């Protein structure tokens, strides 16, 4: 089954002092399969799980025009979304 989709996100930076500037990013969102059981022999949890994650991304830089010094912001943006191990 599974499902893990790329979704476009508009994010508004509203910092006092710096100019209002919008940023368009992508994020992963979806439903992946997983099952867990309490293993008492190991006295912990035994997990076998999928999570919708980014397999590859791409950093996004932007200047934030501030009154007391321009800043340089870095954000990852998704390129391919997929159901993968939650722990890697």
């Amino acid at each position: 089954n599974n499902s893990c989709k790329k979704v476009g996100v508009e994010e508004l930076i509203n910092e006092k002092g710096c100019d209002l500037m919008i940023i368009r990013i992508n994020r992963c969102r979806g439903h992946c399969f997983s099952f867990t059981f309490p293993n008492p022999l190991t006295k912990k949890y035994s997990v076998h799980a999928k999570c919708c994650r980014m397999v590859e991304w791409e950093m996004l830089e932007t200047e934030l025009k501030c009154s007391k010094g321009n800043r340089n912001l870095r954000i990852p943006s998704a390129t391919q979304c997929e159901c993968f191990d939650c722990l890697v």
């Binding site: 089954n1 599974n2 499902s3 893990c4 996100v9 990013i25 994020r27 992963c28 969102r29 979806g30 439903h31 992946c32 399969f33 997983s34 099952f35 867990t36 059981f37 309490p38 293993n39 008492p40 022999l41 912990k44 949890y45 997990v47 799980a49 999928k50 999570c51 919708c52 994650r53 980014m54 991304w57 950093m59 996004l60 912001l73 870095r74 954000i75 990852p76 943006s77 998704a78 939650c86 722990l87």
Partner: protein, 106 residues
Amino acid sequence: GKECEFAMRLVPGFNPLRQVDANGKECRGNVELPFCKGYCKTSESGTHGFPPRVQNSKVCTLVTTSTRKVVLDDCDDGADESVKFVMVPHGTDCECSAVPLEQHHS
């Protein structure tokens, strides 16, 4: 629909469970374990600063509401301190939780 599902089953290692005591007498017996399976909504998104990634990662965990003492039938004589029984956390419903993702031998 419920992002998970609950069902008692038999783990192959626990099918049947073996446990040994001092002087080498063993108690065996099937032990049902609580199994939570399903599709939890998960996400990974890029963010500012450090760490650059954010994981809303969640798995099908059970809601522990009690503790179950199963015992082992086919017992060798002289079963002492540790055996004849075993303790299993028990519940009746499953929920999406990230706690099974934190105890990686921490």
